[PDB]
From Swiss-Prot, chains A, D, E:
Organism, scientific name: Escherichia phage P2 (Bacteriophage P2)
Main subcellular location: virion
Keyword Acetylation attributed: no
Keyword annotations: Capsid protein, Late protein, Virion
Chain residues in the propeptide: 1-9
Name under which the protein is recorded: Capsid proteins
Lineage summary: Viruses, Duplodnaviria, Heunggongvirae, Uroviricota, Caudoviricetes
Subcellular localization, as worded in the UniProt entry: Virion
Length: 327, 48, 59, 327, 327, 48
């Protein structure tokens, strides 16, 4: 439709898993950071060349077929191919900034091969930081302080908050009644609670909430923290009588993965290629400084990113889970 | 009217058909009003 | 090559010969040659518009 | 629209009375059978390459002209070019099968030039059979017996039955009244009947029933049997007083033809290129056999055909005609 | 669209003020006539090749921009580019024809260079005649007499009558009331009349009548006769006291021009390129004659023209203006 | 059905979209009605 795009389409007429445009520095750094960890491998880190606009669709499927009597009657109105619920992403900047003291710098520089170790260390410290900030982080507020927000809850809006304030009716936070708007503030799961066990929970959740299309899919994952998983699998091992059941770690007929710093009282069921992060093409600005006022060598780096779930009707999350007995 | 004949063809797969439009310019005319008459309302049959 | 003009007279006859007293004082009156009533006309447009269906086209 | 068809149409952009596709055996046999008789010459025998679908149009005419103020107003909706009443043909097989006894075979083979005579004889026996079965033959029933159906009334649905059970209100079978649904079962035509003579009958029939388009046509024929034609022209000759009136044989200001085995009590007014027969391209399967159990040499042949009237609004037929006096 | 038009348009895809079709005889004469006077220079004399059609749009503007939600909703319907109020011109012939007496011709033939002088004289006599006939001339009537119509007001329909009959509500000729259909016959302008002075008149007229598009335009002129201009500018100069105001002659904050024979009791506000005259391409037919029956050499010349103002909503005129005191 | 696959693409800027139509001819069929059965209305659970 545009000049180059019209040419490419006319040419269409007459690895395919990740997206590249041109070899630059920020793309290379992002690719390195992805290859570092393992969880970033199973996710889409997309470079975009715009400050605000439309998102692309990945793993979206909609039934497109019908039959119409074109012979003397109505016409054929085609259905849309990529029409999602709501799609408007807004990329924003976040920046890291640190310093090394002269003493520690000298101690490290004494031995050989220190630059490579420092590079690998900062890359590893950065990737896990992306994850931790993404899964937490209700809202973004300028001049973020790390006094009362140690879990990094103020950098940018995360996937969970995206689900919370962008597409409600896909979350579960209370047991209610037609007269009792809050019959139960917390979803008790136990012998006497509102469920039998986590299996029935994830089962009826994946039955009711998510759409019938993705419901029948060869790929679904139940992202859950570490406290809840261990709380479920501990009473199994604490018995007297088969140990393979600790290797696969399936719950509710669905494979389970665990990511660090995930909130303990919630779990999100979705396909692992549906959520993604977008980053501006060339915004990785990095500067050094060697001020002696505090005898420290400091550095600043800034990058423009934005987390985004592609199709909100893909997965759903349950929040405020509490296991007990409730006699 | 000479040099007035516009023929175009369209192919709209929205319906399953191929359309064709043609436009010309004509007018009928009797040369002379003499050498011609006509009778209009007749009814052959029988009467009293 | 134009509209609202004159009717090209094809197949029109008549009687043109006569006689006059040219010496008495009168003069020869040249009766018209193409004498017609309401020699004007016009032109209008007419269009044929039709579609052929795919199946029959294949046939 | 299809590949070859799209190419042929694009080429269109930048004898014409019969249809051929490719030189094959069944087409050659059908052409020979047509050239044999005379009535088959004035009819369309069309080869088709499908077991079921749409029929082609021949001799169909519909007024296509208007004028529309495209300048600031409505648009131009084109009218259809070939849209008939109902059009869905279904080809089916019929087969001939006979045998020659050894005695007759020997007697014939004794004299020279016997194969050509046999071929011409069977072709002649087959063409007239096509006609006889086409004009008669209400319905098709498997395992057709020739005990009580000597007029070949069980092979396939014929043109007359097509008119009867496909497009009613184009037939005439009873004189009725608003209170008497059957005021007269049979259409009496005589000095005291419901008419004056056959001329007035065919006249008001061609006035009322058939459509105004084909009504004003340079080609129309009144197909009638032999008994009725002779019954009409006999009292003319049986008088005492010009003999050319037997050569042209016009009735009701329309030329008249007669075909063998046509039902005596009916007549059909229509143009002689409106009705037709379709046949599959390659279905003429023929096998020989020389079993001595009954000392006869037999042969079987099968062909897939279907009779079809193209546009039902072309002609109309009157049925159950009876001439008398009716004082 | 047409052959030549489609070719030229396809070429377009892949002095600019006057129109020339082809070098001919009538176009050349019209050009040499226009070059004579100054008023004809600031006007469009267009050659057309049709006896009746639609008028070329010159100096027409409008509001064409818009914005529509194409994303899942309504479509884009373009507005027309050139759609005026009423556009149907009808050209027809007029003819002037004079004669020279033998005495005067014999006298002129003595001094050399007489043919050129006669040619220039007749050209000047025709140009001013076009003007005078165009601005006057309510209606056309065959066999036009020149006894009771000395101002040449019977040749053809003029611009003023065009405004009068084709598009009312753009002309003001009476001050009325809801009960008084004619409270005052003429628009009295004076110390006690219906207006303060001509300036306020033309000011509120150009405020109300004409359209807001042309209302704000750098090209507007108030065509007025000679009597009214002098009536307005005489009491100013007839004082005792600032003498350059006679140079430009602006009224109502608008430049004013004067043309001969313009009706004294009316004025017309509009742009000077909005009104125009069309003429047939090849209709200038001329013949000579030397009959001594009245010893005079006569000539007959005929040309097919038609006056036309392009967009009626461009300018407006006021009629029956009377200046006085009205105590 | 072989040789029945019609694909056309249209570009109508009247809306801001590019349309694509494709038509094919298919029919599902079970080979033999033997070697196959099905149970339709079941409900696992508990009863009296």
């Amino acid at each position: 439709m545009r000049q180059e795009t019209r040419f490419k389409f006319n040419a269409y007429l007459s690895v395919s898993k990740k997206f590249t445009v041109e070899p630059s520095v920020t793309q290379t750094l992002m690719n390195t950071m992805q290859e570092s960890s393992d969880f970033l491998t199973r996710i889409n880190i997309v470079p975009v060349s715009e400050m605000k606009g439309e998102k692309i669709g990945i793993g979206v499927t909609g039934s497109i077929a019908s039959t119409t009597d074109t012979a003397g009657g109505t016409e054929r109105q085609p259905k849309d191919f990529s029409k999602l619920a709501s799609n408007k992403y807004e990329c924003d900047q976040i920046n890291f900034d640190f310093y090394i003291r002269y003493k520690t710098l000298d101690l490290w520089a004494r031995y050989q091969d220190f630059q490579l170790r420092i590079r690998n260390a900062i890359i590893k410290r950065q990737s896990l930081d992306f994850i931790m900030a993404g899964f937490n982080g209700v809202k973004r507020a300028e001049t973020s302080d790390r006094s009362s927000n140690p879990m990094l809850q103020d950098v940018a809006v995360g996937w969970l908050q995206k689900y919370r304030n962008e597409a409600p009716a896909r979350v579960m936070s209370k047991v209610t009644d037609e007269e009792g708007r809050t019959t139960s503030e917390v979803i008790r799961v136990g012998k006497g609670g509102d469920y039998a066990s986590l299996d029935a929970l994830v089962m009826d959740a994946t039955n009711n909430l998510i759409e019938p299309w993705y419901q029948e899919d060869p790929d679904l994952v139940v992202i859950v923290g570490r406290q809840l998983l261990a709380d479920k699998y501990f009473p199994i091992v604490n018995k007297e009588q088969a140990d393979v059941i600790i290797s696969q770690k399936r719950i509710g007929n669905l494979p389970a993965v665990r990511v660090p710093y995930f909130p303990a009282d919630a779990m999100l069921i979705t396909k692992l290629e549906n959520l993604s992060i977008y980053y501006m093409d060339d915004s990785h600005r990095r500067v050094i400084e060697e001020n002696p006022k505090l005898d420290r060598v400091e550095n600043y780096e800034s990058m423009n990113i934005d987390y985004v779930v592609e199709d909100y009707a893909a997965g759903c999350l349950v929040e405020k889970i509490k296991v007990g007995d409730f006699s």
